Design a protein around this ligand. Structure first.
Ligand SMILES: *[C@@H]1O[C@H](CO)[C@@H](O[C@@H]2O[C@H](CO)[C@@H](O)[C@H](O)[C@H]2NC(C)=O)[C@H](O)[C@H]1NC(C)=O
Ligand SMILES: *[C@@H]1O[C@H](CO)[C@@H](O[C@@H]2O[C@H](CO)[C@@H](O)[C@H](O)[C@H]2NC(C)=O)[C@H](O)[C@H]1NC(C)=O
Lengths: 49, 48
């Protein structure tokens, strides 16, 4: 857990180069599960305003 | 001679390297892992 990656240098490098099903699934799921879930309550308010 | 015995006893102590090679390597690995966990562990806000 001391190896955190951002999106630009390092997540969409896995997604562009890798050929490992499990690593691609990990990156895809975790980006949407850890950062995507923070934007839901903000987007719901953004829509209304 | 107690002086000679003191020096030889300081020099004769095996310390590590009494273990196997697998066991010694595993020990060094967990030592380094614990040190690195302590040195670079991070906690962050519950609201940011
Ligand atoms: C062996 O033990 C003797 C005494 O038990 C040591 O003799 C001493 O030697 C140092 C220098 O070598 C002197 O300054 C002391 O005065 C000596 N002590 C006595 C009581 O005579 C001897 O040094 C020891 N062996 C070694 C290699 O150190
Ligand atoms: C230090 O470790 C060695 C093994 O790595 C122990 O085993 C003795 O080693 C000497 C030197 O080769 C042999 O002559 C003996 O036959 C070995 N077996 C014994 C003494 O039972 C050694 O005993 C250890 N020394 C200490 C002080 O722990």
């Amino acid at each position: 857990p001391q190896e955190c990656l951002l999106l630009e240098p390092g997540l969409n490098e896995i997604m562009a180069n890798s050929l490992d099903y499990n690593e691609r699934l990990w990156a895809w799921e975790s980006w949407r599960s850890e950062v995507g879930k923070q934007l839901r309550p903000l987007y719901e308010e953004y829509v209304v305003l | 001679n107690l002086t000679v015995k003191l020096q030889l006893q300081a020099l004769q102590q095996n310390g590590s390297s009494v273990l196997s090679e697998d066991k010694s390597k595993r020990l060094n690995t967990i030592l380094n892992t614990m040190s690195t966990i302590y040195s670079t562990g991070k906690v962050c806000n519950p609201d940011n």
